Amino acid sequence: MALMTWTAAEFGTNVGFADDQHKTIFDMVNKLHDTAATGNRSEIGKQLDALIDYVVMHFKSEETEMQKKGYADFAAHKAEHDKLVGVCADLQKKFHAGEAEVNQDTTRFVRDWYVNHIPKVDKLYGPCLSA
């Protein structure tokens, strides 16, 4: 089974770009999750790096919109993003040094992060960003 399934009831923000970017993240995580059950380390690394670049771009997209519109909780929301980016960059540094592996606990971690963040953090920006 795919690790991540997006539905509007669970995850819809009422902000079209953000929903689309979330769908992409779920698809990219699902590919990583599959590859993480193998020993194909170069393929894991390609998909890890692609995912993380995209995630940083998604967070930038949300942050630019939040900030330009004066969204109430922008700085606290960005703090959540920045802590995940730090975790991901650390994981890349270790993985690309040969010091850590990417496995399905890695991908379940990121799944956990998104399935909590989108409903509890991203949905809150819907009224502001959709207005």
Binders of Fe ion in range 40-79 (CB under 5 A):
62
* Beta strands, E only, the chain: none
Residue 122 marked in a binding site: yes
Residue 33 marked in a binding site: no
Q: Which long-range contacts (CB under 8 A, 24 or more apart) does 67-74 make?
A: 69/128, 69/129, 69/131, 70/128, 71/125, 71/128, 71/129, 72/128, 73/124, 73/125
Q: Which residue is nearest to Fe ion (CB)?
A: 122
Q: With respect to Fe ion, which residue has the nearer C-beta, 45 or 119?
A: 119
Residue 27 marked in a binding site: no
Which of 57, 52, 31, 30 is closest to 43 using CA atoms?
Answer: 31
Indicate which single residue of 33, 74, 122, 129 sits in contact with Fe ion (rule: CB under 5 A).
122
Q: Is 13 in the site for Fe ion (CB under 5 A)?
A: no
Q: Is 29 in the site for Fe ion (CB under 5 A)?
A: no
Residue 96 marked in a binding site: no
Q: Which residues bind Fe ion (CB under 5 A)?
A: 62, 122
